Design an enzyme around this catalytic site. Structure first.
Site, PDB file in Angstrom:
ATOM      1  N   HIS A 181      -2.499  30.711  31.798  1.00  0.00           N
ATOM      2  CA  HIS A 181      -3.261  31.831  31.193  1.00  0.00           C
ATOM      3  C   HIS A 181      -2.674  32.319  29.877  1.00  0.00           C
ATOM      4  O   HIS A 181      -3.431  32.840  29.069  1.00  0.00           O
ATOM      5  CB  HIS A 181      -3.192  32.909  32.291  1.00  0.00           C
ATOM      6  N   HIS A 215      -5.008  22.295  39.581  1.00  0.00           N
ATOM      7  CA  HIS A 215      -5.382  22.567  41.009  1.00  0.00           C
ATOM      8  C   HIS A 215      -4.833  21.507  41.964  1.00  0.00           C
ATOM      9  O   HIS A 215      -5.161  21.536  43.135  1.00  0.00           O
ATOM     10  CB  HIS A 215      -6.907  22.820  41.128  1.00  0.00           C
TER      11      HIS A 215
HETATM   12  C1  HEM Z   1     -12.610  25.965  35.059  1.00  0.00           C
HETATM   13  C2  HEM Z   1     -11.376  26.287  34.762  1.00  0.00           C
HETATM   14  C3  HEM Z   1     -10.573  27.016  35.778  1.00  0.00           C
HETATM   15  C4  HEM Z   1     -10.931  27.947  36.715  1.00  0.00           C
HETATM   16  C5  HEM Z   1     -12.257  28.638  36.938  1.00  0.00           C
HETATM   17  C6  HEM Z   1      -9.820  28.342  37.475  1.00  0.00           C
HETATM   18  C7  HEM Z   1      -9.865  29.309  38.516  1.00  0.00           C
HETATM   19  C8  HEM Z   1      -8.680  29.740  39.207  1.00  0.00           C
HETATM   20  C9  HEM Z   1      -8.685  30.776  40.170  1.00  0.00           C
HETATM   21  C10 HEM Z   1      -9.834  31.698  40.499  1.00  0.00           C
HETATM   22  C11 HEM Z   1      -7.437  30.815  40.717  1.00  0.00           C
HETATM   23  C12 HEM Z   1      -6.918  31.730  41.771  1.00  0.00           C
HETATM   24  C13 HEM Z   1      -6.133  32.943  41.286  1.00  0.00           C
HETATM   25  C14 HEM Z   1      -5.574  33.576  42.571  1.00  0.00           C
HETATM   26  O1  HEM Z   1      -6.377  34.076  43.431  1.00  0.00           O
HETATM   27  O2  HEM Z   1      -4.297  33.599  42.772  1.00  0.00           O
HETATM   28  C15 HEM Z   1      -6.638  29.792  40.112  1.00  0.00           C
HETATM   29  C16 HEM Z   1      -5.388  29.370  40.507  1.00  0.00           C
HETATM   30  C17 HEM Z   1      -4.655  28.375  39.821  1.00  0.00           C
HETATM   31  N1  HEM Z   1      -5.062  27.685  38.767  1.00  0.00           N
HETATM   32 FE1  HEM Z   1      -6.886  27.550  38.013  1.00  0.00          FE
HETATM   33  N2  HEM Z   1      -8.808  27.504  37.164  1.00  0.00           N
HETATM   34  C18 HEM Z   1      -9.148  26.824  36.027  1.00  0.00           C
HETATM   35  C19 HEM Z   1      -8.360  25.960  35.324  1.00  0.00           C
HETATM   36  C20 HEM Z   1      -6.980  25.811  35.483  1.00  0.00           C
HETATM   37  C21 HEM Z   1      -6.162  25.041  34.607  1.00  0.00           C
HETATM   38  C22 HEM Z   1      -6.673  24.372  33.356  1.00  0.00           C
HETATM   39  C23 HEM Z   1      -4.881  25.069  35.127  1.00  0.00           C
HETATM   40  C24 HEM Z   1      -3.611  24.477  34.689  1.00  0.00           C
HETATM   41  C25 HEM Z   1      -3.465  23.323  34.080  1.00  0.00           C
HETATM   42  C26 HEM Z   1      -4.918  25.928  36.348  1.00  0.00           C
HETATM   43  C27 HEM Z   1      -3.897  26.081  37.269  1.00  0.00           C
HETATM   44  C28 HEM Z   1      -3.983  26.865  38.422  1.00  0.00           C
HETATM   45  C29 HEM Z   1      -2.892  26.996  39.361  1.00  0.00           C
HETATM   46  C30 HEM Z   1      -1.564  26.298  39.343  1.00  0.00           C
HETATM   47  C31 HEM Z   1      -3.309  27.944  40.228  1.00  0.00           C
HETATM   48  C32 HEM Z   1      -2.595  28.456  41.486  1.00  0.00           C
HETATM   49  C33 HEM Z   1      -1.788  29.728  41.352  1.00  0.00           C
HETATM   50  C34 HEM Z   1      -0.921  30.014  42.511  1.00  0.00           C
HETATM   51  O3  HEM Z   1      -0.481  29.048  43.210  1.00  0.00           O
HETATM   52  O4  HEM Z   1      -0.542  31.227  42.699  1.00  0.00           O
HETATM   53  N3  HEM Z   1      -6.255  26.194  36.595  1.00  0.00           N
HETATM   54  N4  HEM Z   1      -7.541  29.023  39.288  1.00  0.00           N
END
Ligand code: HEM
Ligand code: HEM
Ligand code: NA
Ligand code: NA
EC number: 1.11.1.21
Lengths: 713, 713
Positions: free
Chosen positions: B77, B244
């Site tokens: 982010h 993800h």
């Molecule tokens: C369409 C694009 C994306 C959407 C809509 C999205 C959406 C989200 C959402 C809603 C969460 C959950 C937040 C929570 O409740 O803790 C999250 C978690 C996460 N996202 Fe994404 N994501 C996107 C792209 C990305 C990208 C590009 C990356 C990194 C390269 C990323 C890495 C992660 C990781 C590592 C988590 C997990 C966080 C945790 O383990 O606490 N995401 N994503």
């Protein structure tokens, strides 16, 4: 575009500490306005101003063929925003040319006056500031019309962006009292720090309080607002009667004809506003306030006709052509000249607020004395005009040019001239050792010097340690200054002083004002030693001690700190949160946010808190100059909550055991909460930052100790 | 407190040009971050980060015992606010820690992640910026979990206040499209310069467009928003699937349990927010987004299980415990580990936007290839993650430390190394004379150099004259650059260059990029000579010429000036007033208000306007460097009115005769209207100002010329 202030409108605003940077300033880093002014041919500027007075421009023709009244009003409005509560407003930074003041309804058509001055400003350039020029122009206007002024000082440096001033909370220009953001409560109590009765007014409503034309009730508002601008009854009467000996008001037609104020006008207006659709929109058809009053039979000449008319007629309530309330002399002949047509004459007229000077019992007595003794009126007005126009300039050492009055006036908080040799660096070292051998502690020495120096405010350049006024009434009795502790420190310093002065030759002596500051320096040095650092704190001698008779006790009252976050002090409970008041105080001290942060963190560990409160004293080595405040504040092993007993005191408990480690106020914890402040605290709370912390503290300490040293400027 | 923004909410805001002053900065004036970072023991910082990853704190327990997923999301982010349209946003200034980003709903609980890093930040102090640490921590997370990164560069200096970014006009966090301040119009056209679908999101809504859980429609929003963050289809799939592969979302209970974001929270929260009343408020009971998805069977280890699950199951629409739409694998076994209870397992789950990767036909092809060839997936993600996290760092010259990748990437707008001796001061003087002898005019030379250098923007440090990309596609064809005029100038300069370079010994030569800049310097010198002033314009050699093959034409498109007030240019008709666009361009050039004003006034009289327009050319000595723009602008003898033909063009007529003297645009006349700009114009329009005007013009011209010279930094 949605901004942070839209999302979080009650968040603390630090941008007020970072105004007036070198970024917004078009002059070079080295530009020194005093030096430019000192070479101005002031006599030449005054000749140009005298010529201007009767050089009518067709886009804003001169009433009676002389712009003197208009420029007198222009200068009086320049000065007349001043509030003694905070020292903010006044003529000293030329803020009438910026928002919001350039568009206040009470400054209507003063945009024309300032535009009339452009050719002079252009000719003389950086050698005369707009700020000085506005005042000088008023002076010249009075001289042109036969009134001898008391004097003039230059040295008001121009500013380059709007000042951040609280002018009130109303969202409607000129809102009458009792609305959702009312500046009044109780028995017509105007909130501090305000000094005007409605948003966009200078002092009072010329139709009477909230537009009700009762001259006795108007007099109450006049007295209250003018007292909040540092003027007593005699000065008030002299200023109003003096001003309204000249010129006229402008109310030829309905106010609905007048268009947007300058900040709202179209770009083609080129900085002007209030364009009027009434007839020619100017001159004989001018509309400014909506009143239509000409006070004297010779509006372009000094006269005693104001009081002749005020007392010589009985007055009847009428309305102007715009519908405003005003007064007309019963049974009078048409003796007042018209401003444009030599075949018309008018009856004498007055504002409600003019009639106050007759119908308020205490003013009536002054007004009569001025009527019977016009030399007294002349002298009172000249003096009061000088006061009005210089009240925010600071100590006399800042007054420039060949027209500065020699007479020293009580309101200037005068400081005696030094007439002996000063102490040198060897003497400073000897006195610091004496101070440390006396048994005074770091906490006492720091707290006393802080108390002396921190009365300074940059808004009107009053206060500071020069003068040793901390030993006099009323500073010595202020609760924030800890009167009993203060007296014991001062007695020990005065014995040190007596002993050092009795041992000297050749006239050398040290002032108590110097010694208080020097002793604070010794305290800081000792505290750095307590922490293992070898630090020498700079000191500049040359302060002198003022007498009680040179210290107006009532005028000093406005400097009393009722909030001083730097000593975790609040005198009572206020509607403004304490962290807001901290940033306010930092602004008056001229501190940036990093300076405020370092200063506050150091003072907490040195024992500067009033009453030796433990709030924010986040260290186990009190009286040692360390960055403990930051390191402990930022420790995530501590969890904070407000106490049940007081929502403004917070307890910080170990997260694992629940044990109490610290207590703090809102002033303490803001540094861990506000995202900009916490970023600063992080820099000083880092492992590499103990040396930087000590050195930056010494720098800011020194800065504060020298705020009022315009003798060395 | 009512402010100028409340009274005049559409007035132009200049405070954006005066952020980042030395007042607000706690570091010394001499602090050089690059020099501090070059001495950081980066390997020691990484070992500390690696330990942190599995050291759970009880105030925010680690999911699965490993904080990797949290810190990956934190670094994505930090980077993911970036917009190519203006280069604003991104990770390069550490802006996630300030408002408004620290309180965006998409950044919920990233406050906890940043706080976990305080002990390491505190240990290393000024040698590692928050900005760099955020990114580094994402890299270390990926490494700790078995993923080989492409590299890391340090060099992002910390900032100390919020950047002024337009993030949209909505007054409600996350407002669905189609309200009164809709960021969408026409056929779901997102307004420039925005790159997110709702206020307070990074890119898209993880439930689907405006909450509608349709993976095909969600894919359209993904593609549009990612393209506006400079990522193509392959990079997009690699980033989302890559991210993800780790961690989980948090949705354990209803969202109404979640309290105030950090900027609104109470002081006792000490900079943290989203405090939750649901059960323990953390760990197993965490609520962040409201979704409750865990994508893979090994959330703390790199794998190719995201795509095995995506393609190996069929998916059913369901709801999280907070009510959010999400997807669960039909018929599957409980194969996904629980984040806290080793006795529980769960079925595979996905977001609507994850399913986009399968159900959009173009993504599906890529996703299949990455599923079948996971080594291609790992390489694409590595490269995309580097790009994402470094896209706003600027030229490679700014990249610091031992992990910088050696491969030169086309998106970096690479510049070849210089491998010959540079021209010296005598050579520069011979070239300037040859340029002036060719018959190139002041107007041509100034306009060419301005066109080459003024593509720089400080937001992402792209553009500038280095490279000589003005001679390449697409710059050579931009309408603002006057393609036919430009081609003829370039041809003359290239003949000068060939002649000079063919005459040298010892390998000395001059690049065309250097000579374009030098020639503009000769133009300014000559214009100063034309006015009677002998000046030398500083010049620093060492630019090099890039090839067409090293220039991505599509990525360069976003640099095209569609509004350039400094050349009185507007490519079409926009909703944003031209003066706003001027101040926007000044901010991207890193100019203060005084610099903007001097520069604009000089460029007008040098002949810099596109098409040789006479608008604002308020001089009868064109091509001489004088202060005529300001003197004539401020002359009250001229009256201004909008033309019948175009309300945005104004005629200036003599007030007395009505004779036509000038025309100008809103860009020209703002300097005579806005009260702060007109106070600046006054300083340069005064009688004592011609030497100051020349000097300050030369200084700001040189500053512009050098904006991209990080080889000399
Ligand atoms: C369409 C694009 C994306 C959407 C809509 C999205 C959406 C989200 C959402 C809603 C969460 C959950 C937040 C929570 O409740 O803790 C999250 C978690 C996460 N996202 Fe994404 N994501 C996107 C792209 C990305 C990208 C590009 C990356 C990194 C390269 C990323 C890495 C992660 C990781 C590592 C988590 C997990 C966080 C945790 O383990 O606490 N995401 N994503
Ligand atoms: C209670 C305090 C005062 C009130 C309510 C007040 C009210 C006003 C009003 C309403 C006008 C007419 C503006 C217009 O329509 O053009 C004005 C004019 C003026 N006032 Fe005052 N006044 C106050 C005190 C002052 C003082 C202290 C001075 C100066 C020492 C001053 C000097 C002037 C002069 C010279 C004009 C005439 C303007 C001209 O000829 O264009 N007044 N006053
Ligand atoms: Na003031
Ligand atoms: Na950026």
């Amino acid at each position: 575009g949605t901004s942070n202030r839209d999302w979080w409108p009650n968040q603390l605003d630090l941008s007020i500490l970072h105004r007036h940077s070198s970024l917004s300033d078009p002059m070079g880093k080295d530009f020194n306005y005093a030096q430019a002014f000192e070479k101005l041919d002031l006599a030449a500027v005054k000749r140009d101003l005298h010529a201007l007075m009767t050089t009518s421009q067709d886009w804003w023709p001169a009433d009676f063929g002389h712009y003197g009244g208009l420029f007198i009003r222009m200068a009086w409005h320049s000065a007349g925003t001043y509030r003694t509560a905070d020292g903010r407003g006044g003529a000293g930074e030329g803020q009438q040319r910026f928002a919001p003041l350039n568009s206040w309804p009470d400054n209507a058509n003063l945009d024309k006056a300032r535009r009339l001055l452009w050719p002079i400003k252009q000719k003389y350039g950086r050698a005369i500031s707009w700020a000085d020029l506005l005042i000088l122009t008023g002076n010249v206007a009075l001289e042109s019309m036969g009134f001898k002024t008391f004097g003039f000082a230059g040295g008001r440096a121009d500013t380059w962006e709007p000042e951040d001033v609280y002018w009130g909370s109303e969202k409607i220009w000129l809102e009458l009292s009792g609305g959702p953001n009312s500046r009044y409560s109780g028995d017509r109590q105007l909130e501090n720090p305000l000094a005007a009765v409605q948003m966009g007014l200078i002092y009072v409503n010329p139709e009477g309080p909230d537009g009700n034309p009762d001259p006795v009730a108007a007099a109450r508002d006049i007295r209250d607002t003018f007292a909040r601008m540092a003027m007593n009854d005699e000065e008030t009467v002299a200023l109003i009667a003096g001003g309204h000996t000249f010129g006229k008001t402008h109310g030829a037609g309905p106010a609905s004809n007048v268009g947007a104020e300058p900040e709202a006008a179209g770009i083609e207006a080129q900085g002007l506003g209030w364009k009027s659709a009434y007839r020619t929109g100017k001159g004989a058809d001018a509309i400014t306030s909506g009143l239509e009053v000409t006070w004297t039979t010779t509006p372009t000449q000094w006269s005693h006709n104001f009081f002749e008319n005020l007392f010589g007629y009985e007055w009847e309530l009428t309305k102007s052509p715009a519908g405003a309330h005003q007064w007309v002399a019963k049974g009078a002949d048409a003796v007042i000249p018209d401003a444009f047509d030599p075949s018309k004459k008018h009856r004498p007229t007055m504002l409600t607020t003019d009639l106050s000077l007759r119908f308020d019992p205490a003013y009536e007595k002054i007004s009569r004395r001025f009527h019977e003794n016009p030399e007294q009126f002349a002298d009172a007005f000249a003096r009061a005009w000088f006061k009005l126009t210089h009240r925010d300039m600071g100590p006399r050492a800042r007054y420039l040019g060949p027209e500065v009055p020699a007479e020293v006036l009580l309101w200037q908080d005068p400081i005696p001239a030094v007439d002996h040799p000063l102490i040198d660096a060897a003497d400073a070292a000897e006195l610091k050792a004496k101070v440390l051998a006396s048994g005074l502690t770091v906490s006492q020495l720091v707290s006393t010097a802080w108390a002396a120096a921190s009365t300074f405010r940059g808004s009107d350049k009053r206060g500071g340690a020069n003068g040793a006024r901390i030993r006099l009434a009323p500073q010595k009795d202020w609760e924030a200054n800890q009167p009993e502790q203060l007296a014991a420190v001062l007695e020990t310093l005065e014995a040190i002083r007596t002993a050092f002065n009795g041992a000297q030759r050749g006239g050398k002596q040290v002032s108590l004002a110097d010694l208080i500051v020097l002793a604070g320096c010794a305290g800081v040095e000792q505290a750095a030693k307590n922490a293992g650092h070898a630090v020498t704190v700079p000191f500049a001698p040359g302060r002198a001690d003022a007498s009680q008779e040179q210290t107006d006790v009532e005028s000093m009252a406005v400097l009393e700190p009722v909030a001083d976050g730097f000593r975790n002090y609040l005198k009572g409970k206020y509607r403004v949160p304490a962290e807001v008041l901290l940033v306010d105080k930092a602004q008056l001290l001229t501190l940036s946010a990093p300076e405020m942060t370092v200063l506050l963190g150091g003072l907490r560990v040195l024992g500067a808190n009033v009453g030796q409160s433990r709030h924010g004293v986040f260290t186990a080595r009190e009286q040692a100059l360390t960055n403990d405040f930051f390191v402990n504040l930022l420790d995530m092993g501590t969890e904070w909550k407000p106490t049940a007993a007081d929502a403004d005191v917070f307890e910080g408990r170990d997260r694992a055991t629940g044990e109490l480690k610290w207590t703090g106020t809102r002033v303490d914890l803001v540094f861990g909460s506000h995202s900009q402040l916490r970023a600063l605290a992080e820099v000083y709370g880092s492992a590499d930052a103990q040396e930087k912390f000590v050195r930056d503290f010494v720098a800011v300490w020194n800065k504060v100790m020298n705020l009022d040293r315009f003798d060395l400027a």
